[PDB]
Design a binder for this molecule. Structure first.
Ligand SMILES: Cc1cn([C@H]2C[C@H](OP(=O)(O)O)[C@@H](COP(=O)(O)O)O2)c(=O)[nH]c1=O
Ligand SMILES: [Ca+2]
Length: 129
């Protein structure tokens, strides 16, 4: 896989944001995770964690996987990096997302993310508390 440039347009919630990619505005949905909706427990915390991570970053990058690049709602499906740290992994490691929506052939980082989830769970963090 490879990282490609993007810039933040606006934070939306724990697992979606609006980025400019190849010069076009798109909503991206993070691969292999599920944050709580804003109206659910830990939803505001997840939203704030993602927002801080992407707004504070000097460099946002998108990494598509091997399969589908857009979902049925037209959202980009990617791993999103902030100054080289993966947002997807960071949410999982903090107990603010569950590993989820693991579809065959867009699951390159599945094992990395499940390792993070195990650690968050051992620590009883947030969703696992
Ligand atoms: C993360 C992801 C979600 N989706 C679709 C599955 C779910 O369909 P349904 O809307 O029919 O439930 C939805 C969940 O996204 P959200 O968690 O953002 O709601 O997005 C994909 O198709 N591919 C993906 O990789
Ligand atoms: Ca969600």
């Amino acid at each position: 896989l490879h990282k490609e440039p993007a810039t933040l347009i606006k934070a939306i919630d724990g697992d979606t944001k609006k980025l400019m990619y190849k010069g076009q505005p798109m909503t991206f949905r993070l691969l292999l995770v599920d944050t709580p909706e804003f109206n659910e427990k830990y939803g505001p915390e997840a939203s704030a964690f993602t927002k801080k991570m992407v707004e504070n970053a000097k460099k946002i990058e998108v990494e598509f996987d091997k399969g589908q690049r857009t979902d049925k709602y037209g959202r980009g499906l990617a791993y999103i990096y902030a100054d080289g740290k993966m947002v997807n992994e960071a949410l999982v490691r903090q107990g603010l997302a569950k590993v989820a929506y693991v579809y065959k052939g867009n699951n390159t980082h599945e094992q990395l993310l499940r390792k993070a989830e195990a650690q968050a769970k051992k620590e009883k963090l947030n969703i696992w508390s």
